[PDB]
Amino acid sequence: FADRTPHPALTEAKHQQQFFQFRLSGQTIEVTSEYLFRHSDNELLHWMVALDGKPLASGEVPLDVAPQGKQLIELPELPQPESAGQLWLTVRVVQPNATAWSEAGHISAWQQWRLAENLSVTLPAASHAIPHLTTSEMDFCIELGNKRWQFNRQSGFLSQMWIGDKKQLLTPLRDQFTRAPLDNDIGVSEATRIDPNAWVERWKAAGHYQAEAALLQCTADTLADAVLITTAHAWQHQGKTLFISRKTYRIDGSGQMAITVDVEVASDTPHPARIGLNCQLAQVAERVNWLGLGPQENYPDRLTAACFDRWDLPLSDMYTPYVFPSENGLRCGTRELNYGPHQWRGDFQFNISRYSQQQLMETSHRHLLHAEEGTWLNIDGFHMGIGGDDSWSPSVSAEFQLSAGRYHYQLVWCQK
Amino acid sequence: YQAEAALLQCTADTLADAVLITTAHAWQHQGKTLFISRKTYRIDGSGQMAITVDVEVASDTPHPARIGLNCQLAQVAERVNWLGLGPQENYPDRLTAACFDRWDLPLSDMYTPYVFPSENGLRCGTRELNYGPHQWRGDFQFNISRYSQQQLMETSHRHLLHAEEGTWLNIDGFHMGIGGDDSWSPSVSAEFQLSAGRYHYQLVWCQK
């Protein structure tokens, strides 16, 4: 920024430009120096092995590598844990002494790998409570203890949740296929010249910002130990169907709501910017805690600098204050998200903030944004890349476009 | 090749207009779990059986060659009719020559008689498959023949293969590439390996 505060992209540059490259083969790390003239005389390697966030083993090794040379670091016998989960190894190069240009402790290079995974073969514990279904003309209502869910039979969405007598939502949980466009999406270098190939022009022309959801199906069924809700919606713009979404909600005796989503996208509509859900939660909390890539904003085509771990930040750090407001603050590769009493589990990307996508799209300057009531949550199964080979022509590469035609993802929503 | 399926869950439920069966299995080899598979079968009043499959693959097992279903059908028919890429054998990294259309061939043309027997006769990008009274719909790759995968793996020469009773059907949601930059070192490119960790696909099985 003009005051010399970093954008999140600066960390991506730092990581790709590092002077140490790493390879893993079994228990061995090979370190390669990309210095041309200096010996690595102010460098030590810290390694850590963690199991879904929890530390297991750790260590340090001095680096003694000639310019353009290699060093092989053998790791100790790593622990075999009992429990399920993925093991992660992280190495970081630390400069122990100050230089003319850096403090003591400066981190100059890092890298992360997956080690052994143990898949979870334990079935969930059978609860004695059965959720109860009530049918009115307008609603399906499910009760279990103090918890209550309500589904609107006309719109076909989850419209409210109660813990005790405290409402949890200000806006229903609905599909989202759009983002507040980024500068790379807008694709303009001269204010007088509009490119009809820019992503934002293609999305407005196809009617992605105006598309209306029509209900096809909304049904409720009692199983032995669960209530199952089934919905289907079609998004249409002037006759043409753009997207179809089929959903199941399974509410069991443990309180957990499992959401399964299947989406179809018309092959001749421009590929969508995302496939996910959004809602406005009623409560504002101070912290956000997640298990996934972080701690800074990261996107499918800008996530090599980010590391899998357990991260915990104040809500204000989950918003990037770009001077021209846009979609911002995404975290990819996430397995668990905790915010107030809610927990979401799955394999998803999310962003969380006090500004809606509609507000970020309508506002030309960051100082004109005002915090809305509650918190906006966007949870995505899939998200398009951001591009940036240039900013005045489409720059997202074909492997980061959502072009598959059919998409599946699942979430669990529970109260921790 | 030796992995054994252990049952985790098998449950049945009546809905308003359907029966729903739920199963889960784990494939294990000497303590280690390689794959988990969760399935639902929904049989409705129209006769159609909808199958939904979700698979998890351990990140440190070598990526699998395919993720699908197989069975041996009791009947032998003369023709195979499908809507999808064809008419010749095609694989995810060799399908640019094939064209989407409605194809109809005798069963014997769905087998490629390579002199050294192997996996053969796959058709990708398929939306509908008809064989005798059965119809399968979805988005899948399939192969159909009188030889099992076990027979093709054990037999060194094509003249020593014998037709089994009935027809073997393999229906895949996902299939690895075949490679061939060379044949004496791993040659499948990373975009054709099944490395995603989690996989979903669905089929409808009905009687036309």
* DSSP per-residue string spanning A265-285: E-TTSPPPSEEEEEEEES---
Residues sharing a CB contact under 8 Å with residue A279, sequence separation 6 or more, in sequence order: A169, A171, A172, A173, A174, A376, A377
Angstrom CA distances, A19 to A11, A31, A32, B81, B91, stand at 14, 10, 8, 59, 41
Yes or no: say if B26 and A121 are a contact pair by the CB < 8 Å rule: yes
CB contact under 8 A, A123 and B9: yes
**Resolution in A for the shown PDB structure?**
2.3
All residues of chain B having their beta carbon less than 8 Å from the beta carbon of residue A86 are 59
Burial of B7 (0-12, 13-18, 19+ CB in 10 A): exposed
- Quick one: tokens of A45? 């390697």
Q: Does A86 touch chain B (CB under 8 A)?
A: yes
Q: How far, in Å, CA of B169 to CA of B111, rounded?
A: 12
Nearest of A403, A385, A402 to residue A394 by alpha carbon: A385
Q: How far, in Å, CA of A324 to CA of A332, rounded?
A: 23
All residues of chain B having their beta carbon less than 8 Å from the beta carbon of residue A115 are 60
Q: What is residue A192's DSSP assignment? A: T
DSSP assignment of B6-62: EEEEEEEEE-SSEEEEEEEEEEEETTEEEEEEEEEEEEETTS-EEEEEEEEE-TTSP
All residues of chain B having their beta carbon less than 8 Å from the beta carbon of residue A123 are 8-9, 24
All residues of chain B having their beta carbon less than 8 Å from the beta carbon of residue A223 are 13, 15, 20
Q: Does A123 touch chain B (CB under 8 A)?
A: yes
3-state secondary structure of A361: helix
Residues sharing a CB contact under 8 Å with residue A367, sequence separation 6 or more, in sequence order: none
Residue of chain A whose alpha carbon sits nearest to that of B22: A223
Q: How far, in Å, CA of A321 to CA of A364, rounded?
A: 12
Burial of A128 (0-12, 13-18, 19+ CB in 10 A): exposed
Under CATH, which number does the domain A18-123 receive? Answer: 2.60.40.10
Cα radius of gyration (chain A): 24
Residues 100..119 of B with a Cβ closer than 8 Å to A: which?
none
Count of CB pairs separated by less than 8 Å, A with B: 36
Q: Are strands A147-152 and A158-163 parallel, antiparallel or unpaired?
A: antiparallel
Nearest of A351, A285, A286, A305 to residue A7 by alpha carbon: A305
Distance from CA of B148 to the nearest CA of A (A): 30
- Quick one: tokens of B94? 């060799």
Angstrom CA distances, B169 to A159, B49, B74, B141, B146, stand at 45, 17, 11, 11, 9
In chain B the first and final C-alpha atoms are separated, in Å, by: 35
Residues sharing a CB contact under 8 Å with residue B147, sequence separation 6 or more, in sequence order: B111, B117, B161, B163, B164, B168
Domain ranges, ordered by start, for chain B: 1-208
Smallest Cβ–Cβ distance between B60 and the set A116, A223, A347 belongs to: A116
Amino acid at B142: F
Residues sharing a CB contact under 8 Å with residue B199, sequence separation 6 or more, in sequence order: B53, B54, B55, B57, B67, B173, B174
Distance from CA of B96 to the nearest CA of A (A): 17
Yes or no: say if A111 and A123 are a contact pair by the CB < 8 Å rule: no
Burial of A55 (0-12, 13-18, 19+ CB in 10 A): exposed
Sign of the Cα torsion A325, A401, A268, A392 reads: positive
3-state secondary structure of A52: coil
In chain A the first and final C-alpha atoms are separated, in Å, by: 38
Q: Does A282 touch chain B (CB under 8 A)?
A: no
The CATH topology of domain A124-416 is Beta-galactosidase; Chain A, domain 5 (2.70.98)
CB contact under 8 A, B33 and A347: no
Q: How far, in Å, CA of A200 to CA of A209, rounded?
A: 10
Sign of the Cα torsion A271, A277, A283, A288 reads: negative
Yes or no: say if A89 and A48 are a contact pair by the CB < 8 Å rule: yes
Yes or no: say if A143 and A132 are a contact pair by the CB < 8 Å rule: yes
CB contact under 8 A, B36 and A119: yes
Q: Does B198 touch chain A (CB under 8 A)?
A: yes
Could you give the angle at the alpha carbon of A134 between the alpha carbons of A128 and A135, nearest 5°? 150
- Quick one: tokens of B159? 């003249």
Q: How far, in Å, CA of A81 to CA of A103, rounded?
A: 37
Distance from CA of B92 to the nearest CA of A (A): 14
Residue of chain B whose alpha carbon sits nearest to that of A406: B139
Q: What is residue A362's DSSP assignment? A: H
Could you give the angle at the alpha carbon of B57 between the alpha carbons of A274 and A247, nearest 5°? 40
* CA dihedral angle for residue A397, residue A398, residue A400, residue A405, rounded to 10 degrees: 160
CB contact under 8 A, B36 and A121: yes
Yes or no: say if B5 and B26 are a contact pair by the CB < 8 Å rule: yes
- Quick one: tokens of A282? 């009623």
Smallest Cβ–Cβ distance between A221 and the set B16, B26, B200 belongs to: B16
Q: What is residue B182's DSSP assignment? A: -
Q: Does A126 touch chain B (CB under 8 A)?
A: no
All residues of chain A having their beta carbon less than 8 Å from the beta carbon of residue B58 are 117-119
This entry's atomic model was obtained through cryo-EM
Smallest Cβ–Cβ distance between B56 and the set A116, A119, A223 belongs to: A119
Q: Does B20 touch chain A (CB under 8 A)?
A: yes
Residue of chain A whose alpha carbon sits nearest to that of B9: A123
Tokens 């303590």 found at: B31
DSSP assignment of A366-383: GGG--PPSSEEEEEEEEE
DSSP assignment of A281-336: ES---SEEEEEEEESS--BTTB-SS-EEEEEEEEGGGGS---SS--S---EEEEEE
Q: What are the phi and psi torsion angles at A186 (to 5°)?
A: -75, -40
Sign of the Cα torsion B130, B131, B136, B140 reads: negative
Distance from CA of A210 to the nearest CA of B (A): 30
Under CATH, which number does the domain B1-208 receive? Answer: 2.70.98.10
Cα radius of gyration (chain B): 18
Annotated binding-site residue? B103: no
Yes or no: say if A349 and A416 are a contact pair by the CB < 8 Å rule: no
Instruction: Characterize A249-263 residue by residue with b for buried, 16 or more Cβ atoms within 10 angstroms of its Cβ, and e for exposed.
Output: bbbbbbbbbbbbbbb
Nearest of B37, B40, B38, B39 to residue B57 by alpha carbon: B37
- Quick one: tokens of B51? 């199958």
Angstrom CA distances, A178 to A170, A346, A356, A407, A409, stand at 20, 21, 12, 16, 17
Q: What are the phi and psi torsion angles at A70 (to 5°)?
A: -120, 160
Distance from CA of B14 to the nearest CA of A (A): 7
Amino acid at B106: P
